[PDB]
Amino acid sequence: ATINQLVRKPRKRMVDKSDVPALQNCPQRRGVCTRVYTTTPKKPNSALRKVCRVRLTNGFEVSSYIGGEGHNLQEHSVVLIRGGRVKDLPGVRYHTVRGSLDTSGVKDRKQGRSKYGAKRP
Amino acid sequence: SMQDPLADMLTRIRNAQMAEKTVVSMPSSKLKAAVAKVLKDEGYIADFQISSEVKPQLSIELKYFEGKPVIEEVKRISRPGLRQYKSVEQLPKVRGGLGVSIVSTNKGVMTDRAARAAGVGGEVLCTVF
RNA sequence: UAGUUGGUGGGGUAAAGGCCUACCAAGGCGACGAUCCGUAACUGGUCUGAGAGGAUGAUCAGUCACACUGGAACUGAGACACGGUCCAGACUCCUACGGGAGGCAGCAGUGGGGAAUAUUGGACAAUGGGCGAAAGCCUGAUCCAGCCAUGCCGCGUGUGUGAAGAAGGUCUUCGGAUUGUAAAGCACUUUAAGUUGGGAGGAAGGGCAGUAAGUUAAUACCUUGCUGUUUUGACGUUACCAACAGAAUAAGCACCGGCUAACUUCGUGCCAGCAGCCGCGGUAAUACGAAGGGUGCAAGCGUUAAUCGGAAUUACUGGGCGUAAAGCGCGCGUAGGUGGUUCAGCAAGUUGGAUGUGAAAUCCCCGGGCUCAACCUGGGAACUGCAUCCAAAACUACUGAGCUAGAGUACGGUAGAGGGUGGUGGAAUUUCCUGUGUAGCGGUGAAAUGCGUAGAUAUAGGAAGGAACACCAGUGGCGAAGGCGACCACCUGGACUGAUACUGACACUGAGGUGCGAAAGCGUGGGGAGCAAACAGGAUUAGAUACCCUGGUAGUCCACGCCGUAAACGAUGUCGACUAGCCGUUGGGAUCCUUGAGAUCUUAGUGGCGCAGCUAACGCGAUAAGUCGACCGCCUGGGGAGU
RNA sequence: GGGGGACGGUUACCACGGAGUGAUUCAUGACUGGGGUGAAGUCGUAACAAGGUAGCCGUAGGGGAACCUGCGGCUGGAUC
RNA sequence: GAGAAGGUGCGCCGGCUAGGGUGAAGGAUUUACUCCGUAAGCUCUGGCUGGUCGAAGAUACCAGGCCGCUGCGACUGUUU
Numbered sequence A: 001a002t003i004n005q006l007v008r009k010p011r012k013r014m015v016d017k018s019d020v021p022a023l024q025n026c027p028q029r030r031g032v033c034t035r036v037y038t039t040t041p042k043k044p045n046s047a048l049r050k051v052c053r054v055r056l057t058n059g060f061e062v063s064s065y066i067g068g069e070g071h072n073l074q075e076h077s078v079v080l081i082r083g084g085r086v087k088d089l090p091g092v093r094y095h096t097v098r099g100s101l102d103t104s105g106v107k108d109r110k111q112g113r114s115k116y117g118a119k120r121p
Numbered sequence B: 001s002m003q004d005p006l007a008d009m010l011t012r013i014r015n016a017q018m019a020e021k022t023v024v025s026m027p028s029s030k031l032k033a034a035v036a037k038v039l040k041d042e043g044y045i046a047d048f049q050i051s052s053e054v055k056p057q058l059s060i061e062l063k064y065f066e067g068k069p070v071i072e073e074v075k076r077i078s079r080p081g082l083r084q085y086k087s088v089e090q091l092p093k094v095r096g097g098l099g100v101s102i103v104s105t106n107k108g109v110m111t112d113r114a115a116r117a118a119g120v121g122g123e124v125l126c127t128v129f
Numbered sequence C: 001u002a003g004u005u006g007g008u009g010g011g012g013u014a015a016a017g018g019c020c021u022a023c024c025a026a027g028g029c030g031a032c033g034a035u036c037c038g039u040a041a042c043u044g045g046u047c048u049g050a051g052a053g054g055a056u057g058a059u060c061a062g063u064c065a066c067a068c069u070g071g072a073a074c075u076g077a078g079a080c081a082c083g084g085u086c087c088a089g090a091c092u093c094c095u096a097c098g099g100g101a102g103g104c105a106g107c108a109g110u111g112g113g114g115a116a117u118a119u120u121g122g123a124c125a126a127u128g129g130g131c132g133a134a135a136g137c138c139u140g141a142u143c144c145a146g147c148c149a150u151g152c153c154g155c156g157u158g159u160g161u162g163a164a165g166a167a168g169g170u171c172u173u174c175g176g177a178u179u180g181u182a183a184a185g186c187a188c189u190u191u192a193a194g195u196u197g198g199g200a201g202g203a204a205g206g207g208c209a210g211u212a213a214g215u216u217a218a219u220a221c222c223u224u225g226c227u228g229u230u231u232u233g234a235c236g237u238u239a240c241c242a243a244c245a246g247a248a249u250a251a252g253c254a255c256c257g258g259c260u261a262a263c264u265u266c267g268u269g270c271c272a273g274c275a276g277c278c279g280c281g282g283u284a285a286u287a288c289g290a291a292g293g294g295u296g297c298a299a300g301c302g303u304u305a306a307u308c309g310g311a312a313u314u315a316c317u318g319g320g321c322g323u324a325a326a327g328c329g330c331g332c333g334u335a336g337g338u339g340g341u342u343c344a345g346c347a348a349g350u351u352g353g354a355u356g357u358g359a360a361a362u363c364c365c366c367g368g369g370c371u372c373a374a375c376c377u378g379g380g381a382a383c384u385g386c387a388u389c390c391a392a393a394a395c396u397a398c399u400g401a402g403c404u405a406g407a408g409u410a411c412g413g414u415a416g417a418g419g420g421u422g423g424u425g426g427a428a429u430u431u432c433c434u435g436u437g438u439a440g441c442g443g444u445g446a447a448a449u450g451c452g453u454a455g456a457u458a459u460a461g462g463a464a465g466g467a468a469c470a471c472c473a474g475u476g477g478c479g480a481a482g483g484c485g486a487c488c489a490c491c492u493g494g495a496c497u498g499a500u501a502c503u504g505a506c507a508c509u510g511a512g513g514u515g516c517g518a519a520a521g522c523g524u525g526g527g528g529a530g531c532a533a534a535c536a537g538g539a540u541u542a543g544a545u546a547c548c549c550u551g552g553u554a555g556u557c558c559a560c561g562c563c564g565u566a567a568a569c570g571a572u573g574u575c576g577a578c579u580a581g582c583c584g585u586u587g588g589g590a591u592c593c594u595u596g597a598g599a600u601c602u603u604a605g606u607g608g609c610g611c612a613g614c615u616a617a618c619g620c621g622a623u624a625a626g627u628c629g630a631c632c633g634c635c636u637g638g639g640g641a642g643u
Numbered sequence D: 001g002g003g004g005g006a007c008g009g010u011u012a013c014c015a016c017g018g019a020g021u022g023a024u025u026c027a028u029g030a031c032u033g034g035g036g037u038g039a040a041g042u043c044g045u046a047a048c049a050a051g052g053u054a055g056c057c058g059u060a061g062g063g064g065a066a067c068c069u070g071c072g073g074c075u076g077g078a079u080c
Numbered sequence E: 001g002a003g004a005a006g007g008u009g010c011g012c013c014g015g016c017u018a019g020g021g022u023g024a025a026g027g028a029u030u031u032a033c034u035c036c037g038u039a040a041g042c043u044c045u046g047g048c049u050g051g052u053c054g055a056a057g058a059u060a061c062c063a064g065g066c067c068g069c070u071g072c073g074a075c076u077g078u079u080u
């Protein structure tokens, strides 16, 4: 474009938005849980992923993901969620911190214990 | 209706050194007749002649040190509609000081090596290698 | 938008003003974005970047705005006043029920919210403020301690010797390899932490006494030099120094399939699980879970959140538009952008210089202090700016005068389906009339529906009516594009070509705005030959709304008005200038020996090949997508959606 | 005694509050219109070769659904 | 639609201040059923400021109830 057009209508830089729309500019967030589904992934895998649905303190009702190897998460129990985009499942955009409030980590684990929250033997 | 005369003198020079011509003849002015004087003293053409009466011409003879010509590129800087003005600090240097750059100063049309010695800025015209 | 925008007269305030009022006048602002909506305290600076820029305004500093909510004035040098006054409201508390009281967005602290943020400290010794200057008195600003790996910078967790290469571990071709001089063993070392002793600097003063100067009428008082004497520290067990103990007091965290430094066994078998992207796992997994080994960093390491880089991915520096996304359907034209050629003037741009400024800090450079560094600090540069003066005059602007190469006019002359209004033809189709004549016609891969002795098709004669315009006809013409083919009259636009005079830059492009817009369709009125969506029947067909067959209405045609889109195509905006060739063709002048089936050259069109050059390639290539200018339109992953 | 002053009275200005009619913005609503995805399933076979009737673009009419037909345009059209 | 809805002003007594219309004392002169044009008067409009009286100022008779959804018939009209 010529110079005499950019004087009349300057170059307006396009903007993005957050891939984590909930927890507005904060790294963690707590919420109480509602339902513990066990859903199935997309096509090229085969598994049965474990998904909980959380109502935060913002009022939002978003699904989440639970890692590890076994969870004690009965309903109406507080958790502490954080971001993280699971490629496999649809609609899942949040992980869940282990060992923080109620989830209490995992057991008999000796590689990468600061992830999943395990102590030192 | 041509809007810029001096970007037409430089266009005929660049084209004639691909048809391997020797003499080029374009209409003249009191600015084009001063630019070709500068290209002669730096040395890119042979000579030039202002030879007519009511449509005065400019006949330029070109050089060939090789099959490749002596001028390899040339571009207009202060195109009409940009009007590039430079002081002595921000005055450019082409190819580490091996090309020439023609700057219209307060003391006449002179090259970049001359006005920087005199300390007079001005308006750039072209960057001939 | 009606104190709204000016004027006048009078008030009002430290001070100019519609600040206020009384009449006068009908103005003012706006596409250079007023008005309105949504959000946000700005700035010196911080964070990235090579740079241009991009985000962002914690601590420190300057300015503004508030002090439970909404008002209002007083006092005063100066407030429309955070610990003042009055009022209204909301909310707590007191009461003898009549009435009262209060405002932590001061320092601590509690409750609440939250992913998340500290002690109800110590003092006036220092620097400062207020009052009194006579010392003193106040100070939750200051100066200091407490808490928290919250960050940057520094130091420890020992050093040397030591191969029977020990056990022990893991792997193995069963030979060994590896953990590994690493341990153990032996010889030394003691910073920090612990313990003991010592120990500055932050202190300037004040009191008291003495003395000398000047004040004076009176060296009485008092002020000032100076001397002498006495007194003062929150920090504080100060930094710092010496001695003693002994190797004792002190290492994790992620990762190891590719990007990417670093690997093999054991469980598991499309399960559990992994993941920043590619993607691994179905019975041998260097990707899941473990075990050895190894690599990165260290008093920290990892994930998440959030900005700038990489992103030439909003391209000013620094990109694109024939087919990848991207050139309006074409014109004319206002605001605006750009300007052929000679002088002359001027100095608004432009360059050079001087002065005033651009707070201090921060960043950068050279130094100086803390055992080093972070940290503190002296001097300089810089802060790209804005303003006032002085000079230069090439280019742009402005002004004055010219010139004819752009552009336009006058004069001959050709070529054309360029428009509009009427008129007139000939061939063919159909309907109708009439004669002759008599059994099928028509249709199709093949048939059937249909039409026929109530005389069809054929064939001859006649009448009426409607629309299209063979051959010429061609990469041929004309038009701004859509478009435009019978012949003649009638009005009427522009282009070509030659000669010659004149005007003397009168030009280009064009957001908004104005027009002309195929076909289908829509409105009122005409008109009804053929063709033919919708439809009807036959056939084909598992099925056939479809293709094919026999029929057949709106429409196609005309007048008037509307709609505005198309593969509206050269998938290529308009305008101007340069760049090897060859073969065609429309129209027009040339030159030329002349008989030419002539010759060559030159403009205005329209075609086929082709060198440089460009292009991702295909391919364009004097009718550019080549080399360059002036203005405009437009593009930013696919769907969602031109919705 | 005058002058002057205060207090009362009264007008102006003004906050709270009350009234009517509008905008605009979120929160939600029986039933409806599409879109994206999925992995089962049914009905077909429209498009890509002359995809078995050459495709597409505009427009109208019709149809379970891809789509079919009409009028005009296009080569991004292949056989000769 | 619509005088939608809905709201304010209104009495007497003065103080000022804009006019409007007739008119004629005179002149123009066409000299007479003529053109222009005053004063004073009567008359009809208004303006902006004071005072004042009452629970009450279009003080009596006189004279719109308004708005939101929906059926049917375009309307004014005519009919036992």
Ligand SMILES: [Mg+2]
Pocket (backbone or CB within 6 Å): C049
């Ligand atoms: Mg960069």
Ligand SMILES: [Mg+2]
Pocket (backbone or CB within 6 Å): C104
């Ligand atoms: Mg506090």
Ligand SMILES: [Mg+2]
Pocket (backbone or CB within 6 Å): C203
């Ligand atoms: Mg001391």
Ligand SMILES: [Mg+2]
Pocket (backbone or CB within 6 Å): C247
């Ligand atoms: Mg030790």
Ligand SMILES: [Mg+2]
Pocket (backbone or CB within 6 Å): none
């Ligand atoms: Mg593993």
Ligand SMILES: [Mg+2]
Pocket (backbone or CB within 6 Å): none
């Ligand atoms: Mg960039």
Ligand SMILES: [Mg+2]
Pocket (backbone or CB within 6 Å): C333, C510
């Ligand atoms: Mg134009």
Ligand SMILES: [Mg+2]
Pocket (backbone or CB within 6 Å): none
């Ligand atoms: Mg500074």
Ligand SMILES: [Mg+2]
Pocket (backbone or CB within 6 Å): C568
């Ligand atoms: Mg076309």
Ligand SMILES: [Mg+2]
Pocket (backbone or CB within 6 Å): none
């Ligand atoms: Mg197009």
Ligand SMILES: [Mg+2]
Pocket (backbone or CB within 6 Å): E073
């Ligand atoms: Mg009725």
Ligand SMILES: [Mg+2]
Pocket (backbone or CB within 6 Å): none
């Ligand atoms: Mg009756």
